[PDB]
Design a binder for this molecule. Sequence first.
Ligand SMILES: NC(=O)c1ccc[n+]([C@@H]2O[C@H](COP(=O)([O-])OP(=O)(O)OC[C@H]3O[C@@H](n4cnc5c(N)ncnc54)[C@H](O)[C@@H]3O)[C@@H](O)[C@H]2O)c1
Ligand SMILES: NC(=O)c1ccc[n+]([C@@H]2O[C@H](COP(=O)([O-])OP(=O)(O)OC[C@H]3O[C@@H](n4cnc5c(N)ncnc54)[C@H](O)[C@@H]3O)[C@@H](O)[C@H]2O)c1
Ligand SMILES: O=c1ccn([C@@H]2O[C@H](COP(=O)(O)OP(=O)(O)O[C@H]3O[C@H](CO)[C@@H](O)[C@H](O)[C@H]3O)[C@@H](O)[C@H]2O)c(=O)[nH]1
Ligand SMILES: O=c1ccn([C@@H]2O[C@H](COP(=O)(O)OP(=O)(O)O[C@H]3O[C@H](CO)[C@@H](O)[C@H](O)[C@H]3O)[C@@H](O)[C@H]2O)c(=O)[nH]1
Lengths: 390, 390
Amino acid sequence: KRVMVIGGDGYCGWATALHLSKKNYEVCIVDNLVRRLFDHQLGLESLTPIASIHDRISRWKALTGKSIELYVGDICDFEFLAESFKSFEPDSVVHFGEQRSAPYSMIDRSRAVYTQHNNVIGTLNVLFAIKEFGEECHLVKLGTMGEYGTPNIDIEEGYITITHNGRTDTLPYPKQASSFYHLSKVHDSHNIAFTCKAWGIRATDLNQGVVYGVKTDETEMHEELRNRLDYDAVFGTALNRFCVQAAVGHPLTVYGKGGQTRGYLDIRDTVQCVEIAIANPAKAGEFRVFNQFTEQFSVNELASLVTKAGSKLGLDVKKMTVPNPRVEAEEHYYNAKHTKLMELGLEPHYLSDSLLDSLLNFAVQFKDRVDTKQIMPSVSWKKIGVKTKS
Amino acid sequence: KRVMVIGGDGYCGWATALHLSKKNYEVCIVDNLVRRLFDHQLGLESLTPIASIHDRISRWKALTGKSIELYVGDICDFEFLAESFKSFEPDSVVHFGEQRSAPYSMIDRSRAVYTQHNNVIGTLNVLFAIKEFGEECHLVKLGTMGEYGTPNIDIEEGYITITHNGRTDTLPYPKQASSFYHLSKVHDSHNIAFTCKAWGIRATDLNQGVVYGVKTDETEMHEELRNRLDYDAVFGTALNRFCVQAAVGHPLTVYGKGGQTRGYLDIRDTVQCVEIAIANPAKAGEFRVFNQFTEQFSVNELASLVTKAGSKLGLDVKKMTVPNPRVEAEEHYYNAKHTKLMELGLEPHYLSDSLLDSLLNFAVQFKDRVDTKQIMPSVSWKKIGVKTKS
Ligand SMILES: NC(=O)c1ccc[n+]([C@@H]2O[C@H](COP(=O)([O-])OP(=O)(O)OC[C@H]3O[C@@H](n4cnc5c(N)ncnc54)[C@H](O)[C@@H]3O)[C@@H](O)[C@H]2O)c1
Ligand SMILES: NC(=O)c1ccc[n+]([C@@H]2O[C@H](COP(=O)([O-])OP(=O)(O)OC[C@H]3O[C@@H](n4cnc5c(N)ncnc54)[C@H](O)[C@@H]3O)[C@@H](O)[C@H]2O)c1
Ligand SMILES: O=c1ccn([C@@H]2O[C@H](COP(=O)(O)OP(=O)(O)O[C@H]3O[C@H](CO)[C@@H](O)[C@H](O)[C@H]3O)[C@@H](O)[C@H]2O)c(=O)[nH]1
Ligand SMILES: O=c1ccn([C@@H]2O[C@H](COP(=O)(O)OP(=O)(O)O[C@H]3O[C@H](CO)[C@@H](O)[C@H](O)[C@H]3O)[C@@H](O)[C@H]2O)c(=O)[nH]1
């Protein structure tokens, strides 16, 4: 099967591209590498140095003999997207190619607008390319667990059966995103759902939880295949950030009360889940929604786990309460359902002492490359302005 | 109070601008007049000839002495929007400035993309301008009854209290839009809701039903104040279209079975409802949602009413079943709640024999200007392509 991995130079995308290639799918990467430009523009950098996309692909070929095709361009440019689609003829498209940082989407008006335009229009272009050049192509889209917000009821996998005023129906689960980025994903999902019904498009919305980890079987095969590990306050996420903080001796940055609860999963399960979604495709006109995560953790819980893990390495981990830059519930009910992927055969890598030990040791050995100036958050949800920030 | 009417040269906007001015609000119109360009580009034309926005405003001033300020520009251009906002300093902003045609949004990829970009980004710009230049400014947004789709349960006014797995919560009503235009409104609503919570913005989402009629007290005061009446298959809507069809002797174009049910309201109630929303503003951080319509009608019901009304004028109205160009339920349950505006004092103009007689006679007297080539729909929801159509 032929798979087009949009956003394949990214964190989830690169790991996924290699895995699918290893699993014998014909693979191509469609990416404009704008994420790398963001690093330069904001003064950010991955904990570990990564190779250029060209050297990454060249190394994979040198090691395995397998060639991952590369199309460098902006999917918002339909001419480029159309040519890439016609040239590659994918059977499946995995869409990781979007501005995914919540903080980034809240920097200022221009970045909030860029986030929504890039994400929503790019996804519309993908739907139109599938419809026009390969209507049977299965779209595996990365949505977000953030689409559901934190309601006082159980979170289902995309749909909910409601009995209202004596009548019953199964409707899309109410969405309550808390950032312009999270909102763009909600828009994506609604747009895709419509095309499934109107055009018979087949798609799977993967509402993934926060990803942690840097190693996967494929990326560890050579230094040039190494994935990125972000720890800064813009693109870095909770667990990965805490591990790097522990390694450099910086107190764990708990935003607000720390009761914020979310689903999490090892990057190794990210690639596994995407492969399962590709191997067991949605039917024509079907809009599948999977809650893609393996375990739920509160920020405080992650803090304790990293502290305990850090102790075994004599890191004497400390914690600190950072005035929350975000607007969100810091104490809330959280029970998100996740059985669809398990039902399809998912064999999860639950968070372990071994994983934390590995990730912490990894951070310690590259600690010299950590720019501590990027650890504390400087993007306010409430103070967001119109002047383009530098 | 000062009111900024974005989209004030349009059908709902012009009638509303005049009404608010008459009601003694200081009013300005922000419009790029792109709707007029669409008419030229698609070969469409209003049943009745309308004056230029400049002559419209000049006439109002000549008659009443009141001056409606005019800012001509694209709200997607923040520089222009920011300058207009700072120059006018509105206490309320009524947002009618969006691509509102469902068929238009389905013409091809470029038009679907234009619809979502123009609508979503323009609305984001409005929210940022309010936040930055007048945070207390009340946003009265035009959403759409189409956001709810046609579920098997009662449709509430924006929110629904659900009891799921033994827990209760009031959540946003599940959205199921059936066109790229309707979808853009869903995105708008989700975006606005977020800013109300994150920034304390105060807004009222007016999910209006289909509007019918051409006369309002103000627009009838002089020919140059005349509003537009669309009958073509792109911008024309059900009732208005049927009345013009009856007048020219064209069979009423019933799409599919004709069981499609929706809420409707006289344009006179449109201006009344907007004024009520402005006079009784939302509180800081509040996202009010009103279902703005006065009565529910199926297409078949409208067909019968127009036929009966046309009989009294000896029009011998005929009906025809047109293969539905749209993907939608042609027979469905429909019970949409609408009491919030009534509770705030709305005095509705329910559809009457008098209204139909007036509108039909109006169409008959301008029947010579009707381009019958534009009556039948030529935009398919399913056959939509990527090539920009001419
Ligand atoms: N990182 C996590 O913790 C996490 C968690 C859940 C879901 N996801 C989701 O997975 C997806 C990818 O995330 P990631 O962490 O790998 O992000 P990333 O920023 O590392 O990768 C995204 C890639 O997409 C590319 N891209 C962006 N816009 C593009 C465009 N217009 N055209 C072509 N390419 C474009 C970027 O250059 C980049 O290489 C996103 O949808 C994200 O929300 C990630
Ligand atoms: N017509 C109806 O039956 C109906 C029904 C329910 C809701 N509404 C809603 O009311 C609003 C206005 O509808 P209408 O029928 O008056 O439409 P219209 O096309 O007559 O008016 C819209 C106006 O907005 C302007 N506009 C569009 N994009 C703009 C931009 N980027 N910058 C500045 N101005 C811009 C256009 O030039 C036009 O004058 C829409 O949100 C619509 O969905 C209309
Ligand atoms: O140092 C930190 C970082 C985060 N948080 C909190 O932990 C939670 C999770 O935040 P984070 O790890 O930054 O993830 P999100 O901002 O939710 O976003 C990531 O995880 C989402 C999961 O849905 C994806 O959609 C996004 O693309 C991805 O960037 C939030 O409550 C944060 O406020 C902290 O307390 N301390
Ligand atoms: O000649 C016609 C025209 C329409 N319909 C049907 O009647 C219904 C209503 O359609 P229409 O009057 O075209 O309205 P919408 O496309 O729903 O859109 C209008 O009414 C919406 C109400 O929510 C607004 O959001 C939009 O901006 C406005 O363009 C639909 O089921 C149509 O398929 C017919 O059967 N025959």
